[PDB]
């Protein structure tokens, strides 16, 4: 049967400067007695990019790769270490065995970065005239550059708490400051939008001393 690669842990949260250790265990030995080489490679796949080779033949760092990346191990047990993790190291990491066909991959380790609390800046956007003409109103509330991800966003329309008409999206962590951003979008028919005057989003987050409300008048 096929060689199975088990990566652990599947997710890791570490603060800048901590040592990161990721493991890849193969169901079968990847050591070629003919070569004394271990047929394992490690890749980094940052948000929205293609995989980049970090280490090949288990322990040989690819040219251009920061020396904080260290591959080691042999046979069935391999390790990728980051000696001192940097904000930009946020990525999925995965191992590949190419000892035998079919080549197989580990399940991946997602490395997230821990940092200090950062309060969101909050902004609200009325729907455009162009969109309203079209028959719909999208009202957007933005929470910018905050940490941690935990946040509460509530929509109030003419002081009445809304439910059931909004959707949130959160970004991947920023590669430079390790923060998140979040959008909450309230969508109403034009008819329903013009039934009310005050549109507000209230944001609760541990970086804020108390909830921050942003609003506009239709």
């Amino acid at each position: 049967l096929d060689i199975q690669l088990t990566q652990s842990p599947s997710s890791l949260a570490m603060s800048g400067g901590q040592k990161v250790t990721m493991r890849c265990k193969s169901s079968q030995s990847l050591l070629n007695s003919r070569n004394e080489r271990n047929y394992l490679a490690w890749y980094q796949q940052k948000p929205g990019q293609s995989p980049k080779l970090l280490v090949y033949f288990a322990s040989i760092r690819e040219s251009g790769v920061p020396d904080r990346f260290i591959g080691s191990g042999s046979g069935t047990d391999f390790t990728l270490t980051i000696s001192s993790v940097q904000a930009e190291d946020l990525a999925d990491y995965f191992c590949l065995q190419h000892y035998n066909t079919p080549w197989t991959f580990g399940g991946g380790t997602k490395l997230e970065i821990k940092r200090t609390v950062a309060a969101p800046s909050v902004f609200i956007f009325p729907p455009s005239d162009e969109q309203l003409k079209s028959g719909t109103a999208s009202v957007v509330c933005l929470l910018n550059n905050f940490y941690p991800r935990e946040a509460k966003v509530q929509w109030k329309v003419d002081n009445a708490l809304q439910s059931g008409n909004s959707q949130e999206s959160v970004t991947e962590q920023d590669s430079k400051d390790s923060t998140y951003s979040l959008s909450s979008t309230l969508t109403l028919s034009k008819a329903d939008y013009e039934k009310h005057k005050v549109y507000a989003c209230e944001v609760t987050h541990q970086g804020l001393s108390s909830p921050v409300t942003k609003s506009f008048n239709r």
Binding site: S50, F123, F125, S128, E130, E168, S169, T171
Partner: protein
């Protein structure tokens, strides 16, 4: 020389159709390395599909990919091809060509769906006294009602990147996607600076440039 593997663009196909994806090699000797194909499902899992010998043109398939999959090449054009016939729902994925373990291409995103392609409507998210935090203002573009993913957004033709956030799309109950792209800038400068969002949805040949200014 920089190794380059350029792959064809995102595609939407219906169940049962055939798709042919290309991988054009430049910056190295084509016949020096075999070309492998790897499937990455939306969940991010990776599956090795097989390889093609660039000296002989001979393909070899992984067991799971013996049937509807064909690797081929065009020698004179230093191009490898992945052809998938009788497309199935489960074929939705990003497909990478790769020079063995050495170098991956940028991937081609394939969606298989009976749903029609739909280009986005692009609306300004206009700065104001309530998109003003300290002396910072936010503005953006709402990219609404498109299918399938993905859509790309840039600002000022790539010249504005600092503080830009382009959100992961949400799925609307309509089955269409929607996202926004935002940026923070000085509130003092809203009258003198120009901010244009450039939206590209290749699956529908939709390109739009929307100037975003205080309402």
């Amino acid at each position: 020389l920089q190794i380059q593997l350029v792959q064809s663009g995102p595609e939407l196909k219906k169940p049962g159709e055939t798709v042919k994806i290309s991988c054009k090699a430049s910056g190295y000797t084509f016949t020096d390395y075999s070309v492998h194909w790897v499937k990455q499902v939306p969940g991010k899992g990776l599956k090795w599909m097989g390889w093609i010998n660039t000296e002989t043109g001979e393909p070899t398939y992984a067991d799971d990919f013996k049937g509807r999959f064909a690797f081929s090449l065009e020698s004179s054009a230093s191009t490898a091809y992945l052809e998938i016939h009788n497309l199935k729902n489960e074929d939705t994925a990003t497909y990478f060509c790769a020079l063995g373990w050495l170098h991956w291409g940028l991937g081609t995103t394939l969606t298989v769906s009976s749903a029609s392609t739909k280009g986005p409507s692009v609306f300004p998210l206009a700065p104001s006294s309530k998109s003003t935090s300290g002396g910072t203002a936010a503005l953006g573009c709402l990219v609404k009602d498109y299918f399938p993913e993905p859509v790309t957004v840039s600002w000022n033709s790539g010249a504005l990147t600092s503080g830009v956030h382009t959100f992961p799309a949400v799925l609307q109950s309509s089955g269409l996607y929607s996202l926004s792209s935002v940026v923070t800038v000085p509130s003092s400068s809203l009258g003198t600076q120009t901010y244009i969002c450039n939206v590209n949805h290749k699956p529908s040949n939709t390109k739009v440039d929307k100037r975003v200014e205080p309402k």
